Every structure is written in C-alpha cells, then in structure tokens.
Design an enzyme around this catalytic site. Structure first.
Site, PDB file in Angstrom:
ATOM      1  N   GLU A 113      -5.447 -11.418   5.030  1.00 16.21           N
ATOM      2  CA  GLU A 113      -4.393 -12.126   5.772  1.00 16.21           C
ATOM      3  C   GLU A 113      -5.005 -13.435   6.300  1.00 16.21           C
ATOM      4  O   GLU A 113      -6.120 -13.424   6.851  1.00 16.21           O
ATOM      5  CB  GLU A 113      -3.901 -11.266   6.946  1.00 16.21           C
ATOM      6  CG  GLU A 113      -2.728 -11.894   7.642  1.00 16.21           C
ATOM      7  CD  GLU A 113      -2.079 -10.986   8.672  1.00 16.21           C
ATOM      8  OE1 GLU A 113      -0.967 -11.329   9.141  1.00 16.21           O
ATOM      9  OE2 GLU A 113      -2.680  -9.938   9.005  1.00 16.21           O
ATOM     10  N   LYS A 126      -8.339   1.171  -3.875  1.00 17.97           N
ATOM     11  CA  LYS A 126      -8.631   0.573  -2.585  1.00 17.97           C
ATOM     12  C   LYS A 126      -9.136   1.568  -1.569  1.00 17.97           C
ATOM     13  O   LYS A 126      -9.980   1.209  -0.741  1.00 17.97           O
ATOM     14  CB  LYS A 126      -7.410  -0.183  -2.024  1.00 17.97           C
ATOM     15  CG  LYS A 126      -7.120  -1.477  -2.801  1.00 17.97           C
ATOM     16  CD  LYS A 126      -5.738  -2.035  -2.355  1.00 17.97           C
ATOM     17  CE  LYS A 126      -5.793  -2.443  -0.898  1.00 17.97           C
ATOM     18  NZ  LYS A 126      -4.463  -3.126  -0.633  1.00 17.97           N
ATOM     19  N   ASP A 155      -7.989   3.866   6.389  1.00 22.02           N
ATOM     20  CA  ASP A 155      -8.191   4.248   4.991  1.00 22.02           C
ATOM     21  C   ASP A 155      -9.225   5.348   4.836  1.00 22.02           C
ATOM     22  O   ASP A 155      -9.079   6.214   3.978  1.00 22.02           O
ATOM     23  CB  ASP A 155      -8.601   3.034   4.161  1.00 22.02           C
ATOM     24  CG  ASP A 155      -7.432   2.063   3.909  1.00 22.02           C
ATOM     25  OD1 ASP A 155      -6.271   2.304   4.340  1.00 22.02           O
ATOM     26  OD2 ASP A 155      -7.652   1.051   3.251  1.00 22.02           O
ATOM     27  N   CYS A 215      -7.913  -2.051   8.296  1.00 20.83           N
ATOM     28  CA  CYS A 215      -7.906  -1.145   7.155  1.00 20.83           C
ATOM     29  C   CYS A 215      -8.899  -0.025   7.158  1.00 20.83           C
ATOM     30  O   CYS A 215      -8.548   1.087   6.847  1.00 20.83           O
ATOM     31  CB  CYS A 215      -8.165  -1.891   5.853  1.00 20.83           C
ATOM     32  SG  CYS A 215      -6.883  -3.105   5.446  1.00 20.83           S
ATOM     33  N   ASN A 254     -12.560   0.626   0.112  1.00 18.89           N
ATOM     34  CA  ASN A 254     -12.683   0.436   1.579  1.00 18.89           C
ATOM     35  C   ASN A 254     -13.518   1.497   2.222  1.00 18.89           C
ATOM     36  O   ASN A 254     -14.259   1.236   3.192  1.00 18.89           O
ATOM     37  CB  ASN A 254     -11.277   0.380   2.203  1.00 18.89           C
ATOM     38  CG  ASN A 254     -10.592  -0.936   1.915  1.00 18.89           C
ATOM     39  OD1 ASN A 254     -11.216  -1.906   1.432  1.00 18.89           O
ATOM     40  ND2 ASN A 254      -9.302  -0.997   2.206  1.00 18.89           N
ATOM     41  N   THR A 311       0.871  -1.190   0.000  1.00 18.38           N
ATOM     42  CA  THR A 311       0.000   0.000   0.000  1.00 18.38           C
ATOM     43  C   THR A 311       0.912   1.246   0.000  1.00 18.38           C
ATOM     44  O   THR A 311       1.943   1.324   0.689  1.00 18.38           O
ATOM     45  CB  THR A 311      -0.983   0.045   1.206  1.00 18.38           C
ATOM     46  OG1 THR A 311      -0.269   0.040   2.433  1.00 18.38           O
ATOM     47  CG2 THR A 311      -1.918  -1.151   1.126  1.00 18.38           C
TER      48      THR A 311
END
Ligand SMILES: O=c1ccn([C@@H]2O[C@H](COP(=O)(O)O)[C@@H](O)[C@H]2O)c(=O)[nH]1
Ligand SMILES: O=c1ccn([C@@H]2O[C@H](COP(=O)(O)O)[C@@H](O)[C@H]2O)c(=O)[nH]1
Lengths: 379, 379
Positions: free
Chosen positions: B149, B201, B261, B257, B205, B122
C-alpha cells in the site's frame, strides 16, 4: 615483520591442511601432526586426505610447506599457530570434547608464549574467553571455518567471508593472510569479540536447518492436502526476500552438522525463553514421523532404502512397526547395517522392495519410479 | 482478439486501482465502484487513494480508463473482470469474510457469464475450487497480489513475479497483460493450479515472520548473555544462503499481514503434524514477554512509547504490571489511546518517561539515547 611470517598448523585434517596450503603460497607454513606416517606423506607432497585442490597444490605449486612430528620444531618462532585438531559435541550428554585444542594451547604456551593461536576447530560458545581467563593468557583467538570436506581448499580460495573473533591489528593481520592467498577478491571481512564469533556457526547452521524444516512442513501440508508442492514452493521462492535455494523437500535435515548444531544451540538456550530454537529440533522428529506414516499407509511388506542421513530415521520408524527394510548402498561392503540386509544386486533390490524410498531421485530408479517414494523436487 | 481487450476492475482500493491503471496503458479498463463520489473523482482523473504513481499516471498519462457505478455498463463485454473488493480474516473466530468477492462472482455470472474473473483480493485456501464447484461455473481464477500500500502501482510496474492460478491459454493471456504494462522486463511468471496459488502468500508471509522471529530469538539470547547482537547477526548473514536482509531485531513481527497470516496458516494445519508453523505464532508472544520483562527490570515509574505495531503488545504487558505508559505519536489527534495518555510535546514526553521504548531508533531521540531501549541495529 608481516611480510613473511611463520604459521604453524596443528592438525592436518581438511581444515588445517586447507588453511596451511592456502597460507604456504606466501608464507612459511609448518604442519605438526602426531602421526609420523602422515608427516612423511606430507613431506613427499602427498595429501593424506581426499581433496582434489589440496593434492594439486601440494604436488604442483611452489609452497613453503613442510611437516614434522616435533612440537619444538613446529612451534618455535611461529607468529601464528592455527589449531585445527579434532573436537566433538555429544548432544545426549551435552559434552563438548575440546581436549585436543586444550593440549595445543598447553604446548604453545610452554614452547612459544609469544605465538598468537587461532582456533579453527569447532569449540563451545564461550570457550576462548574462558580458557584465556583460566590459564591467564591473552594469545588465543577464535575464527570460524566455513569449509566443506572434499572442497576445503576451494572454499578457502573462494570464501563466503572471513570472521576473526578479536578486534585488533594482530587479528586483522591474520585476516590479511587469508585474503592474500585467496583467488576471490574483496572478501567480506568481519572482526568481532570472542564469544560472538563462536556463536556464528551455530546460528547460521540452525537457520539453515530451520529453512529446511519449514519447507518440509510446507511439503507435509501439500502431501496431506493433495497439492503440488513444487507449484507452491516455486511461487513462494520467487519472492527475492526468500529465494530459490535450500528449499528442496526431504525426509528431514541431516548431514554431519545440522542435527548436532541445532541441539547444541538449544542447550545454550536453557535459560532463554524461546519457541523457534526448540521447534527446529522437534520439527525434524515430526517430519520423520510423517514420512514414515505415509510409507506405512501403503502397506508394504518390504521397504527398500536406496542409499545411506535422515533416511536412517525413516528406516528406524518402519522397523519399529515390524516391517523389514533392505538397503541398497554400493559403498557399504558389509551385508548387514543396523540389523537390516544390505543387498548388492540392484535388480534384486528393486524386485523385492514393495516401496523404494530415496531422499533424492536418481536415474537408476527411473524404471521403477512407480514404486519410488521421494519428496525431492529440484534434484 | 487479445490485441485490445476490455478489463473491468471491481474494487477501487490500491490493489484494484494499481492493476487498472497498469492495464489501462494498453487496453480498455472500466472501474466499478458502489460509491458515486469515488466514481466521479476517478472520472475527473483524481485518485481516491494515496499513491504517488497512481495519481501521476491518472493525471498525466493517456489511459483508456473510466469509472462507473453501473454494473451492467461495467461488466458487459468484459474479457476479464479483476475482483479486488475488501475481504478480512479474523483469527479469533477463524472466519474469512469473502462476501464482497462472492457478490461480484454473482453479478458477473448473471450479467456476463463469458467474462473470465481474476480474483486479486485475499481469499482462503481452497476458495476458488470450492466456489466454482458450488455455483457450477468455470470462469474464476485466483492470482495473488504482492503489492505494498502506498507503492502499489510501482510494485505492479516492477513486480517480483506474476503467479496465475490456472494452467491455460486464458491464464497466460492475463499474465501477458500484466507484463505488457510493466516497466520491468522478463518478469518471472508461474502458472499453477488453483488451491496451490491461494497458499503462496500465506507460506511466503509466514516465512518472513519466521525469519524475523528467528533473528529476534537470536537477539533475546544476545541480550540475555551480554553479547553484541550486531556482531553475531552480521557474521551469520554474510553466508549467502542467509543474506543481509530482513534480519533487524525488533519487539516482534507486526504490520497488517504477518500476525494474521501466520495464524491463518496455523489454522489450516489443524490436521497436519507440525512444530514450526505453531512456533512462529508462539515465538512472537514469547519475544514480547522477553522485551517487556527487560524493560520492567529497569524499574521505570513511567514508560514512554515513541510512535505507534508490535510495540502495542509491549505496552499491554507493561500496563498489566501496573506501570503507566505515555505515548508520543504526532499522527494521532486524540489525547488517549487504549487508556493511556498521548503527549503532544516531545520534550514533555522525554522528561517524564524513565525509559523510552521505540521499535526503531530515530534522530529525534538522539539527545535522550541514554534512556532509550530499542533492539534496532540496522535502521
Ligand atoms: O534444499 C535443501 C537443502 C539441504 N537439505 C538437507 O539439509 C542438510 C544440509 O545440507 P547441505 O548444507 O550439507 O547441503 C542435508 O541433510 C541436506 O539434504 C534439504 O533437505 N533440502
Ligand atoms: O528486518 C526486519 C524486517 C521486518 N520486521 C518486521 O516484520 C514486519 C513486516 O515487515 P515488512 O515486510 O512490512 O517491512 C514489520 O512489523 C517489520 O517491522 C522486523 O522486525 N525486522
């Protein structure tokens, strides 16, 4: 006997007539309207509204359907009465006019207290629980309608879902009537309590406005930063949790429901802490300011509006800065709209406008594409 | 010759190792890591991270894969170098630490200037266009990773889509490598310019955070009004434009995230008029205030937190009002977390807590359900 019931429709607009024609395929339906001319048309199998499927079914299918202006004839012996009379919410005063619905509840209660009323008209959150308590009656249930004007019978033949705001066998029997007449099979069906059912459309329409407002803010950023909005939106929307629908930038969400419903829901949040509900309303004003500012930065001497609803907010802002706006709208027959000229000849419109704005691109603007400002990406 | 290429992975976390194992099924992959112990493990076909599929493929499938701590050995003759080193964005200071990525760009440029670098780490919006301009190089392309993950190789074997931030044959050949190794067929593939790819992203997100924040505000309203949130949400989500996913109320969006984000995207809007972007961040604070206030209204003497991330914000607010919090978290081995006791015995925890809060319901809280506060509806 649920095998063959009598269902009266009070209100012959697209909601009432769509539901009536759907149910008349299998039961006895009687449409009540105050206007004698509308009743005579319906009895001649002529639709008073524009909807291809409604006109085709009335003219070609064997429906046990008739109309009357006589309330006693209409309500007597009815098992259900669908209330689909006009209502309106005014955001400026937070007033929801439900007078036509309350008049039907009055008439059915007097004429046939055993009928079960199903309200399909839009009503305020909490309406049904309150009116039952006020009048001391139990026979009123709300069921949201999810129909599009112009394809109302089609949407009842292929509904997204059926929601009835009461948990009971009589509510389920009404849902069964809606499923029996439909072409789509295994239609999702939900039974809820009353006030919950009345909140569903406001929360669904407000999510749609939020989604449009969000993609419009992404688009404001892309324009501000010199980026390709289509590349960003397509990459984002390829996440299946987001999807490639309802993601086409515009001059703001508009139409006949979203602007009012988002405001109606915000009024209902007067005592509930929130940031998103209020931002959905504010975001639309900010997006229209951004679009107007982008147009004004091109220093046009005349702006042409191609077709007339968020573009109205853009026109208002351009005129506030003292720049004339001309309008191209073949459906309008007047030569003036909100103090601006309506130009009949497309070539005259194209020649005089320095920038032509359009919420969506159109083939007939192809030859002047160089001076067309639109944020449409997908058509 | 694209038939059999050499691809070097710089970074052996889940992103780099997932991509490396995927590509090693058909090409020569060399993993570079600074830690000798990690390299030795990889060469023994032992995964240094927890991911079932990565360990299964390393141990059981014939992969042309090896590891090294030697940069010259790793980068020489590479056709592509995937950069998947650690990076971090700090919202408090708006600082994005990209030092590990810039170190790899430095090393590859010196050792093999003909390699094409693909950044999967990222990075901030505008990073790649700027670094290419700064160093005077052309061989750097960004490609977002959409991996979870713990299921990183599975997500590369069945990806939502592949997005490469350059429109060129060399970008398409890299996309082909990702498709060749995948199990899923006809994977949606998008080629964009650089800065656009880097924004995908953050916008995806942030939409997910907006969606959770919206259903949480609907839930705040339902609780405030004494309504059944599940009835409203199910009715709303039966509209196919909205859908029945990502609609489970909670104490706020969290995870690794979304909180960062949404703030990173808001910082990028410093010069762009908006209301929704800023409201997504504010809404989470308001939702946590609402949840804390609801709990505090029950006048508990001790609140029990069942499992530890938005619940942390709830704990902070309860402690600010002077009420003790105890925590049940079997994975923690310490007896204290942020100045609160961590209780090992579930029955002791259940007995002492006056209200037990949990973001999601769990079977082991079934016998004390009467004092459990959770807004989970769907599991
Ligand atoms: O992708 C979309 C979908 C809808 N709308 C706007 O949202 C409102 C509701 O659209 P619809 O549900 O009536 O099609 C209309 O003003 C429509 O132009 C958009 O701006 N972009
Ligand atoms: O229906 C949902 C989906 C996600 N989340 C929250 O949003 C964050 C991101 O979820 P995920 O994408 O990692 O599952 C997590 O804090 C998760 O609990 C919800 O509150 N409700």
């Amino acid at each position: 006997g649920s095998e063959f019931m009598k269902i009266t429709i009070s209100g012959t607009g697209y909601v009432g007539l769509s539901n009536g024609v759907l149910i008349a395929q299998n039961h006895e339906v009687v449409a009540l309207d105050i206007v004698q001319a509308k009743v005579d048309m319906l009895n001649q199998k002529i639709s008073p509204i524009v909807d291809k499927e409604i006109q085709e079914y009335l003219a070609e299918k064997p429906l046990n359907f008739r109309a009357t202006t006589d309330k006693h004839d209409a309500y007597r012996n009815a098992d259900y009465v669908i209330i689909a009379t006009p209502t309106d919410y005014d955001p400026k005063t937070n007033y929801f006019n439900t007078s036509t619905v309350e008049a039907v509840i009055r008439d059915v209660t007097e004429i046939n207290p055993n009928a079960v009323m199903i309200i399909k008209s839009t009503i305020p959150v909490g309406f049904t629980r309150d009116i039952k308590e006020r009048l001391g009656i139990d026979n009123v249930i709300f069921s949201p309608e999810f129909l599009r004007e112009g394809r109302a019978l089609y949407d009842n033949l292929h509904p997204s879902r059926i929601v009835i705001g009461e948990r009971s066998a009589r509510a389920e029997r009404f849902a069964d009537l809606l499923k029996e007449g439909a072409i789509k099979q295994d239609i999702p069906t939900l039974f809820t309590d009353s006030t919950e059912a009345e909140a569903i459309k406001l929360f669904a329409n407000t999510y749609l406005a939020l989604r449009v407002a969000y993609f419009n803010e992404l688009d404001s950023y892309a324009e501000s930063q010199g980026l390709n909005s289509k590349q960003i939106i397509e990459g984002v929307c390829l996440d299946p949790r987001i999807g490639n629908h309802y993601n086409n930038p515009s001059f703001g969400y508009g139409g006949y429901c979203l602007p009012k419903d988002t405001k109606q829901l915000l009024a209902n949040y007067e005592s509930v802490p929130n940031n998103i509900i209020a931002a959905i309303v504010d975001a639309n004003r900010t997006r229209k300011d951004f679009i107007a500012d982008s147009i004004l930065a091109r220093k046009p001497k005349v702006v042409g509006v191609y077709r007339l609803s968020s573009i109205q907010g853009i026109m208002k802002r351009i005129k506030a800065k003292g720049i004339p706006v001309i309008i191209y709208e073949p459906v309008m027959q007047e030569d003036e709209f909100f103090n601006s000229r309506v130009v009949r000849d497309l070539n005259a419109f194209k020649q005089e406008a320095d920038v032509i704005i359009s919420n969506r691109m159109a083939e007939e603007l192809a030859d002047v594409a160089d001076k067309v400002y639109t944020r449409d990406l997908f058509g």
